[PDB]
Amino acid sequence: LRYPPEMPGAEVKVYKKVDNVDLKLYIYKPADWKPADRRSAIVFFFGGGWQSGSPAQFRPQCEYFAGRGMVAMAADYRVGSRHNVKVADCVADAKSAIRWVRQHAAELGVDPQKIVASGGSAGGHLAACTVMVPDLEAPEEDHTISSQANAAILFNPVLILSREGLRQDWEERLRERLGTEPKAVSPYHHIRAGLPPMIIFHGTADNTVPFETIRLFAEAMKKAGNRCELVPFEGAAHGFFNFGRGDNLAYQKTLELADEFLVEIGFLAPKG
Ligand SMILES: [Cl-]
Numbered sequence: 628l629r630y631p632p633e634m635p636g637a638e639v640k641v642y643k644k645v646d647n648v649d650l651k652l653y654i655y656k657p658a659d660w661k662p663a664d665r666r667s668a669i670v671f672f673f674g675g676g677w678q679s680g681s682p683a684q685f686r687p688q689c690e691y692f693a694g695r696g697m698v699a700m701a702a703d704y705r706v707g708s709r710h711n712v713k714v715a716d717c718v719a720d721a722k723s724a725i726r727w728v729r730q731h732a733a734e735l736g737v738d739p740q741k742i743v744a745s746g747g748s749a750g751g752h753l754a755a756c757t758v759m760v761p762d763l764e765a766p767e768e769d770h771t772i773s774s775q776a777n778a779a780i781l782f783n784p785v786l787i788l789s790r791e792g793l794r795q796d797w798e799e800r801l802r803e804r805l806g807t808e809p810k811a812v813s814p815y816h817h818i819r820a821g822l823p824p825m826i827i828f829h830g831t832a833d834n835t836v837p838f839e840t841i842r843l844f845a846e847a848m849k850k851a852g853n854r855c856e857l858v859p860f861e862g863a864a865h866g867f868f869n870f871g872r873g874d875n876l877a878y879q880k881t882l883e884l885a886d887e888f889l890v891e892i893g894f895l896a897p898k899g
Pocket of ligand 1: 832864
């Protein structure tokens with residue numbers, strides 16, 4: 628995972644300038660893309676503990692979805708190792724990415740109500756925040772344009788960041804680590820009716836993010852009346868879905884299931 632990545636075949640757009648860094652989108656268009664198209668879009672956020680990682684992680688998935696007619700992109704965002712930020716800054720960057728795609732939907736050939744947020748682990752957390760967590764800051768961007776994604780596809784996300792409703796000192800410690808009140812960046816704590824649809828892929832033998840946290844999330848989302856499809860991968864570990872692991876079997880399966888989810892919600896045309 629090189630940073631910055633090459634991302635061969637990607638067009639590069641700076642979606643945000645902040646702390647003297649240009650944050651980029653690596654954009655993959657379908658071969659028949661034309662101006663004035665209104666395609667569904669997907670924005671992928673890499674994983675890495677909000678500390679490290681690279682948009683290269685989701686290059687294969689971007690190529691797949693561009694092949695299916697989406698405008699597919701991988702977003703850079705600030706991380707601890709490179710930028711000395713905390714989780715709340717990462718969340719602001721992810722929201723800025725969705726905002727930017729919506730703002731620029733016309734020139735991207737994109738339907739601004741068919742923008743999917745996606746990511747792995749910490750990036751799956753970010754994608755979830757774009758669907759369901761209120762904005763915590765108003766950066767220098769179009770405030771009239773919503774940051775909220777229209778759907779999410781999450782690969783073993785972190786979804787519970789506060790222990791409330793499940794130690795005042797631990798919540799104080801988390802406040803310092805996250806850059807805000809832990810509940811304010813905890814998707815689980817913002818479960819309500821009327822949220823965008825999503826699909827989640829999670830291994831049952833995940834020792835980083837316990838499967839039980841995701842089962843609790845999905846159960847509560849379903850009780851609130853939301854479409855929240857949880858696909859367990861029996862015995863699979865954290866990062867199982869990545870391109871280049873386990874003969875690409877879980878990679879291919881998550882794409883197949885994600886594709887069908889996007890068909891189900893009317894963001895993709897059926898194959899053939
Ligand atoms: Cl694991």
